[PDB]
Every structure is written in C-alpha cells, then in structure tokens.
C-alpha cells in the first residue's frame, strides 16, 4: 500500500505512527522563526495537519474549514506542518486569521520530522516534502488518530480526526 | 608600524554575530557542485548550466513583498550579459517563487531551492547559518563562476541586512 501521487506510487521513508504510541518529538519553526516542540503545546490536544505544501496557487478551502473546526474544539491546537518556510506561512490561505492554528516548518531540521513520522517523501517531485497525513495527539502526546492519506491529492478523513477530539 | 589585515569577522544580523558552518569559497577555487530544486521541482546542478558563466546570488529568503531596486537591476543586468545565468539560491520552496520580489518579471533568472538536500549546499559554500532566527537558511553572498566553474568573484556579505557589492560582481563578468 504505497502512497501515490496522481495514482503513481511514491517512496516514503520512516514508519508512520500507530494509534496508542507516544508521538515523536520535533523541533519545527514557527512563523516568527522560533523553535516549536511538543512542550510548546503542553496541556493541549494537538492536530498535526501534515501537508506537502500550504503555498499552492489555489486555496485548499476545505482544509481551512477543518483547521477552523478542529481549533475551535475544547483545548485543541492545530499544528500545520510542512516544508514551507515561515515567510510563506504568514500568507497561507488555510491558516491566516485563525487562533489556535499554528504553522510549523520542517526547514531547520530537514528530514527529521518527516522521517520520524513516516511521511518523508524520497522520490519524484515531492522528494524532500512531507506526504499528506493527519495525526491527532492527546494532552500527553499519545496518538489517538492517525491517517496517512493513500493518494496525495485526496482529502484526509477530517471527520474521523474531528470525532477523535469529541 | 605595519598592521596585519584582519581576518573577516563573523557575519552579523542586525549587528549581532551569527554562526556559519562550512568554508566560504576563495577566488581561483573550483566551485562545489550541488543538487538544488528549480521552479518545476526538477533538480539543478552545475551540469544544468554547462559552459555558462554563473552568478550564484545566495539569499536567506526571497519571499518578501519589498526589495532593493539595486538587486533587481543587478539580476537583470547579469542575466542580460552574454553567456551568463543568474541562479538565485535560497531555502524558499519553489511554490513561493510567485512572490519573489527580486526576480519578478525577470524570466531568465533561475530560482534554485535548497529544500531537497537540506544544509548540503550551504555547508559546501560556507553559508550554513547555525544560530539565531536564520538557523537553517543560507547567509547572504554572491559567488560568480566562469565558464569552467572557477570562482572569479566571491563576497560573503558582512551584515545580512546589507546589500552585496553588485558592482564588483557584475564587473567581474566583463
């Protein structure tokens, strides 16, 4: 069951997290160039919304609605993870203006986050970006929901991720 | 008395010393190769530009709405010269190139991203910032290569917020 892009298999490195696992820590970069780790979000449920890029010419409007809905649930932060630099993150149509939606870039630690989460694309045009996934963590960073989207172009099961927080 | 010329101090950001990894190239050296990513997500290396003079315009980020006219004039002038390509190197993803202030309307300027190979380019060129807010970006530099990839001009800009000596870089191609 390789992930595909336009139906074409791509290679991913690392092992995708299982429900019940302790989430791997990270050092991602916020839109003000500071480092973000799991401790930066202590006490909150976290939605890791992992996307190859949030800087596409056309807005992923459905992702904006999901980001808004999840972040409006009790004690929840949505962490939008991608290789996009913080300079681009300040313009993301899916995050701008939304409280408790926080952009977090992989650029400073390279492939570390993606590899730790089994979303490190290593072939084709997306080589060096994250694959598409949604991983929900509880306050103590136990994985309560995890989806590696089989086709990069497809929408995640946002309903399942939201329901995991209810 | 005679006073020895000072070895270049640490690059600064807003006057603040920052740490750089790698060794910045000297004039006369053969340029290190690289695998950078173009606007179409394909790989670019020195072989992509075989036999051309190359300007590597190395920038922490190109993704800003406002920029120096001198930078644009330099990019245009160098790209207009015979057998010359201007390659603008940064960590910005190719997706952001639509917003690159300094390359807007200059179709021959080639954007080349470090994202796929991480710190490899920056470390090979001695511009790998490892401290402060620019940690993981390239420092500011201009490196000019001749048609056989020998370094003919190289400036590691002393202060990130300052402009390179574009006049010197351009004049090296005459």
CATH code assigned to B1-174:
3.40.30.10
Tell me, yes or no, if B101 is annotated catalytic.
no
CA B101/CA B73 separation, integer angstroms = 12
Say whether residue B135 is in contact with chain A using an 8 A CB cutoff.
yes
Best to test chain A binding among B36, B64, B95 (most A CBs inside 10 Å): B95
Q: How many angstroms from the chain centroid is the CA of residue B100?
A: 14
- Give the gyration radius of chain B's Cα atoms: 15
Q: Where are the domains of chain A?
A: 1-166
Give the closest residue to B89 by CA, choosing from B11, B41, B141: B141
Give A18's DSSP letter. Answer: P
> Hey, what are B104's tokens?
């807007």
> Hey, what are A129's tokens?
């970006």
Which residues in chain B are contacts of A32 at CB distance < 8 A? 133
Long-range pairs for A86-89 at CB < 8 Å and ≥24 separation? A86/A29, A86/A30, A86/A31, A86/A32, A86/A33, A87/B61, A87/B63, A87/B64, A87/B92, A87/B96, A88/A54, A88/A55, A88/B63, A88/B92, A88/B93, A88/B95, A88/B96, A88/B99, A89/A31, A89/A54
Q: Which residues pair with A22 in a beta bridge?
A: A142
Give the closest residue to B63 by CA, choosing from B35, B104, B115: B104
CB contact under 8 A, A85 and B95: no
CA B145/CA B53 separation, integer angstroms = 6
Give the closest residue to A161 by CA, choosing from A149, A150, A151: A149
Give the residue from chain B lying closest to A92, CA to CA: B96
Provide the CB-side half-sphere exposure for B164 (13 A, CA): 25
Give me the catalytic one of B67, B96, B120, B152. Answer: B67
Which residues in chain A are contacts of B135 at CB distance < 8 A? 108
Q: Which residues pair with A121 in a beta bridge?
A: A12
- Nearest chain B Cα distance for residue A65, angstroms: 22
Query: What is the maximum span of chain B, computed from C-alpha positions, in angstroms?
Result: 58
Residue B77 vs residues B62, B84, B151: alpha-carbon distances, Å:
18, 10, 19
Residue B120 vs residues B84, B138, B167: alpha-carbon distances, Å:
24, 11, 29
CA B76/CA B105 separation, integer angstroms = 9
| End-to-end CA gap in chain B | 38
CA A133/CA A121 separation, integer angstroms = 12
- Nearest chain B Cα distance for residue A29, angstroms: 9
CA B34/CA B142 separation, integer angstroms = 16
DSSP assignment of chain B: ---PPPPPPPPEETTEE--EES-PPPTTSBPP---EE-TTS-EE-GGGGTTSEEEEEE-S--B-S---HHHHHHHHHHHHSTTEEEEEEES--GGGGGGBTTTTT-TTPEEEE-TTTTTHHHHHTT-EE-SSTTTTSB--EEEEE-TTSBEEEEEE-SBTTSPP-HHHHHHTT-
Say whether residue A108 is in contact with chain B using an 8 A CB cutoff.
yes
Which residues in chain A are contacts of B117 at CB distance < 8 A? 128
CATH 3.40.30.10 is the classification of domain A1-166: yes
Q: Contact, B126 vs B23, CB < 8 A?
A: yes
CA B109/CA B67 separation, integer angstroms = 16
Compute the 3-state secondary structure of chain A and give helix, strand, coil in percent, each to the nearest 5.
Answer: 20, 25, 50
> Hey, what are B41's tokens?
């997500």
The residue assigned the tokens 């790209």 is: B79
> How would you classify the pairing of strands B20-21 and B128-129?
antiparallel
Q: Which residues pair with B113 in a beta bridge?
A: B37, B90
Q: Contact, B156 vs B31, CB < 8 A?
A: no
């Amino acid at each position: 069951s390789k992930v595909t892009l336009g139906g074409n298999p791509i290679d991913l490195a690392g092992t995708f997290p299982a429900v019940g696992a302790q989430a791997a820590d990270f050092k991602l970069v916020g839109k003000d160039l500071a480092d973000l780790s799991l401790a930066s979000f202590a006490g909150k449920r976290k939605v890791l919304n992992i996307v190859p890029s949030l800087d596409t010419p056309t807005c992923a409007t459905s992702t904006r609605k999901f980001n808004e809905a999840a972040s409006s649930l009790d004690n929840t932060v949505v962490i939008v993870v991608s290789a996009d630099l913080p300079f681009a993150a300040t313009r993301f149509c899916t995050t701008e203006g939304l409280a408790n939606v926080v952009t977090a870039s992989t650029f400073r630690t390279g492939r570390a986050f993606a590899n730790a989460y089994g979303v490190d694309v290593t072939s084709g045009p997306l080589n060096g970006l994250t694959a598409r996934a949604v991983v929900v963590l509880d306050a103590q960073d136990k994985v309560i929901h995890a989806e590696l989207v089989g086709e990069i172009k497809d929408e995640p099961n946002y309903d399942a991720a939201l329901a995991a927080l209810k």
